[PDB]
């Protein structure tokens, strides 16, 4: 029945996680008590992809909530849709991870991970046919980053043949909690290279630039950053959540999007970012515009291996097609010529709430190499001087392991440069 299991880990993971569930619960007609109160069955046709149906015909997110501190998960349990998650599926410890990847992966989180895998096992076993996993987390702290990638390593061992996708918030010095963020992100990326099928790269710098420059928000909060991530995750998952779409599951999608195992880090985009609805040309122009991209990379600095785009609302399919075929046939220099017909498009009649038309974009571009170059530079700047390393060697890690994370990401970056040529 194409069930997906959702995990959200740490402060950032659970906050963008909670919003994702607010947004898609609204679209599916599910109220903050789990009772369905919508008007179309289109809303219910794929409701079991993300929701278990509990006993009194309530719907319960198939969602596991994970953190090493109680503080953000008491927040969730107290927000608008707090009551909707299954109480057993809150798994937390008391110690924290202190923004420390080694505490998340090796010490603190190791204590807690078996208990998460117990909930995951119990959600999986009730799945008619489990389609794969999705994980929300940041890469810059400790729980979502270090324990998050520890979970993925363990889920692979236990379900080596299911798809594992992540929505991963990349740190930026312009929106920063601590200096050690590049250390945690570099160790995190190496895990993701080996252990996920798809990673949506959400750069916190780009999210901030979008609120500041485009949305005209002079002082953006995480709330404002997260509102963008939420709307993008809702778009991305439309073809899975709504009927009549492509007869495709996570594995089919992953196959068509990832031409090479390690090159699976994607740039998401969204349009529009008002009462004037956008014409189909306006959507197609904004969607491919650099300013609408959430990985703070210039697509005119690399080449698209594959692109997928969904349009939501009531609009001409032929018109979506002419515009899409106009964008490609005008900048053919930015798509690789050796994957024929590598741009794919869909329309869904149901638009997002508060909007008449929208476009969500998913691009496997070699420009993403710019993001790993950025993290790699921040990393080396500190690591040459072994700055801040004591926080990590105090938890049992060795310098050798940093060198290897640095080397694998440098590898990854040059692997992208091989294909942009």
């Amino acid at each position: 029945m194409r069930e997906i299991v959702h995990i959200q880990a740490g402060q950032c993971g659970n906050q963008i996680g909670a919003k994702f569930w607010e947004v898609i619960s609204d679209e599916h007609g599910i109220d903050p008590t789990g009772s369905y109160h919508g008007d179309s069955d289109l809303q219910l046709e794929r409701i079991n992809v993300y929701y278990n149906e509990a006993t009194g015909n309530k719907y319960v997110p198939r969602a596991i909530l994970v953190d090493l501190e109680p503080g953000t998960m008491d927040s969730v349990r107290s927000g608008p849709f707090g009551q909707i998650f299954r109480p057993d599926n809150f798994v937390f410890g008391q110690s924290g991870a202190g923004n420390n990847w080694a505490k998340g992966h090796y010490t603190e989180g190791a204590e807690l991970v078996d208990s998460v895998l117990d909930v995951v096992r119990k959600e999986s076993e009730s799945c008619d046919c489990l389609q794969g996993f999705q994980l929300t987390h940041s890469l810059g702290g400790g729980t979502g980053s270090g324990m998050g990638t520890l979970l993925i390593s363990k889920i692979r061992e236990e379900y080596p043949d299911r798809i594992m996708n992540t929505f991963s918030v990349m740190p930026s010095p312009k929106v920063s909690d601590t200096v050690v963020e590049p250390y945690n992100a570099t160790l995190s990326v190496h895990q993701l290279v080996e252990n996920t099928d798809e990673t949506y790269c959400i750069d916190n710098e780009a999210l901030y630039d979008i609120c500041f420059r485009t949305l005209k928000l002079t002082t953006p909060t995480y709330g404002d950053l997260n509102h963008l991530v939420s709307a993008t995750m809702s778009g991305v998952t439309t073809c899975l959540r709504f009927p009549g779409q492509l007869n495709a599951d996570l594995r089919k999608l992953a196959v068509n999007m990832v031409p090479f195992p390690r090159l699976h880090f994607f740039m998401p985009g969204f349009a529009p970012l008002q009462y004037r609805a956008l014409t189909v040309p306006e959507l197609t122009q904004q969607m491919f515009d650099s300013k609408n991209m959430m990985a703070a990379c210039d697509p005119r600095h690399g080449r698209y291996l594959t692109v997928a785009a969904i349009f939501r609302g009531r609009m001409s399919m032929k018109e979506v097609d002419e515009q899409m075929l106009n964008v490609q046939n005008k900048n053919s220099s930015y798509f690789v010529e050796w994957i024929p017909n590598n741009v794919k498009t869909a329309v869904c009649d149901i638009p997002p709430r508060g909007l008449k038309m929208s476009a969500t974009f998913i691009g496997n571009s070699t420009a993403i190499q710019e993001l790993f170059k950025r993290i790699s530079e921040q990393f080396t700047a500190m690591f040459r001087r072994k700055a801040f390393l004591h926080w990590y060697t105090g938890e049992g890690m060795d310098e050798m392991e940093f060198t290897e994370a640095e080397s694998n990401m440098n590898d990854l970056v040059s692997e992208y440069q091989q294909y942009q040529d």
Partner: protein, 254 residues
């Protein structure tokens, strides 16, 4: 914005055509093996016609007509004339020999040939370029450059024979161009094809001492006369390219 590729860099003619296309600002040149193109200046041999007209939302045109080699190979042309129910009074017997023993001779000097450039557009309109050239009479072997253009040859025919170029020679040339191209049309026309063709042709003619015009051969990849490159290559863009891809007469239609 229109996209076009280039796959025949040796083309004396189409180097000037792609040169003009860029100077309009509305045409953009792609890589030779990019398939998301509108127009193609294709290669002379093994040009991949079976891959044209399958790109969603692209109207594709090419500067060659698949099947036109029948006319342009010396061997094939003989076969074409002999086995066509049309066709024959203007083509020398073909299988002293090579051969026309009594050629009209320019004076002074006591032999020449006439090159006409014909352009056939996607609609199969037949366009004869106004300017021909008179040139074994070949630049390879050899007026400035042994090339005499139409106005002089006209002036010679008037003063020397009391006749004009149109009357004595050009009615026969138009009749011959139309006969060859009318004959092969059902085999090569792209009127209801999923892609479109045009093509420039170089007809080579002989004139005998009775002012009879004879067909020598038909060139499928013809060069031009340096003096006429400007005029004709612009006429190409006007009649064959922009008539399918419009932006924002030097031809006799036959």
């Amino acid at each position: 914005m229109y996209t076009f590729v280039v796959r025949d860099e040796n083309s004396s003619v189409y180097a000037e055509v792609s040169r003009l296309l860029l100077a309009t600002g509305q045409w953009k040149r792609l890589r030779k093996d990019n398939p998301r193109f509108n127009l193609m200046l294709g290669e002379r041999n093994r040009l991949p016609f079976g891959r044209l007209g399958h790109e969603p939302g692209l109207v594709q045109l090419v500067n060659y007509y698949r099947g036109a080699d029948k006319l342009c190979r010396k061997a094939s042309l003989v076969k074409l004339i002999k086995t066509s129910p049309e066709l024959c009074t203007w083509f020398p017997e073909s299988y002293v020999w090579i051969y026309l023993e009594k050629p009209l001779l320019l004076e002074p000097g006591h032999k020449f040939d006439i090159r006409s450039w014909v352009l056939v557009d996607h609609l199969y309109n037949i366009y004869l370029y106004r300017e021909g050239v008179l040139r074994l009479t070949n630049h390879c072997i050899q007026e400035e450059g042994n090339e005499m253009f139409f106005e002089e040859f006209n002036q010679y025919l008037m003063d020397a024979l009391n006749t004009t170029l149109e009357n004595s020679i050009l009615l026969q040339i138009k009749h011959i161009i139309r006969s060859c191209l009318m004959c092969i049309e059902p085999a090569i026309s792209t009127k209801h094809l999923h892609y479109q063709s045009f093509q420039l042709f170089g007809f080579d003619f002989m004139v005998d001492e009775e002012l009879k015009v004879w067909l020598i051969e038909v060139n499928g990849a013809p060069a031009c006369a340096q003096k006429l490159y400007a005029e004709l290559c612009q006429g190409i863009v006007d009649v064959a390219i922009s008539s399918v891809f419009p932006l924002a007469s030097i031809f006799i239609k036959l």
